[PDB]
Amino acid sequence: DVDLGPDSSAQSCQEVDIQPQYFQKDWTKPID
Length: 32
Ligand SMILES: *[C@@H]1O[C@H](CO)[C@@H](O[C@@H]2O[C@H](CO)[C@@H](O)[C@H](O)[C@H]2NC(C)=O)[C@H](O)[C@H]1NC(C)=O
Fold this sequence. Notes:
Elements: no helix or strand
A molecule of 2 linked components (NAG-NAG) is lined by residues 3-6.
């Protein structure tokens, strides 16, 4: 077992905005 340093001292996790409709793009690179 190894040690991965000290734990995080943050009092709050980060805030995000999830919009999956903006990430749907038609870029196809199929395997050839
Ligand atoms: C950054 O991450 C590395 C990787 O875990 C930390 O290195 C460890 O530090 C602890 C502190 O006691 C040691 O016990 C481990 O042996 C170290 N592991 C390695 C692979 O180096 C490092 O402390 C971290 N730095 C900060 C500032 O969090």
